[PDB]
C-alpha cells in the first residue's frame, strides 16, 4: 500500500506535509472547506484485488494546538464525522493499482491573521491494514498546512 501528495513520490508510512489553499479572507463565523481529495491519493501496490488494503482515519485526529478551539467536521468515504475525531472512521478498501484520490474533506469553523502560511492547521491520522497474513499495518499522518495567510477583520 502506498500514497502520494500532489502526484509526488510514493509514501509507505509516516508523516507527510499536505499544502492547501485556503480562503484568504473570512468573516466570523464563516466556514472553510478543505478538499483533500485534490492532493492525497493512494493505491494497492499489487493490484487485482489480491491483497486488498483497508484504510480508516483514527480517533484523536484534530486541529493543530493553536487552533484547538476550532469547531469542524471531517467527511470520509460517505460519512461526515465531527472533527476532531472522537472515533475511528469507516473503512475504505483499496485494491487497484490506479491511484485513488482519498474521499476526504475537512470543514473548518474558526472559534488580523488567523492562520499563517506554513502553519499546520490539522493532523489527520490514517491507519492501513491489508488482508493477507498479518496485513502489515502502517500508520500515516497528514499534516495539513496552509499555503497562504488567512485574515479576519
Ligand atoms: C510489507 C507490506 O507493506 N506489504 C503490503 C504490500 O506492500 C508492497 C507491495 C509491493 C511493493 C511494495 C510494497 C510496500 C509499500 C510500502 C511499504 C512497504 C513496507 O515495507 O512496509 C511495502 O502491498 C500490499 C497491497 O498494497 C499490502 O498492502 C501488503 O500488506
UniProtKB/TrEMBL annotation:
<keyword id="KW-0732">Signal</keyword>
<dbReference type="GO" id="GO:0043709">
    <property type="term" value="P:cell adhesion involved in single-species biofilm formation"/>
</dbReference>
<feature type="domain" description="FimH mannose-binding">
    <location>
        <begin position="3"/>
        <end position="143"/>
    </location>
</feature>
<comment type="similarity">
    <text>Belongs to the fimbrial protein family.</text>
</comment>
<dbReference type="GO" id="GO:0009289">
    <property type="term" value="C:pilus"/>
</dbReference>
<feature type="disulfide bond">
    <location>
        <begin position="3"/>
        <end position="42"/>
    </location>
</feature>
<keyword id="KW-0281">Fimbrium</keyword>
<protein>
    <submittedName>
        <fullName>Putative Fml fimbrial adhesin FmlD</fullName>
    </submittedName>
</protein>
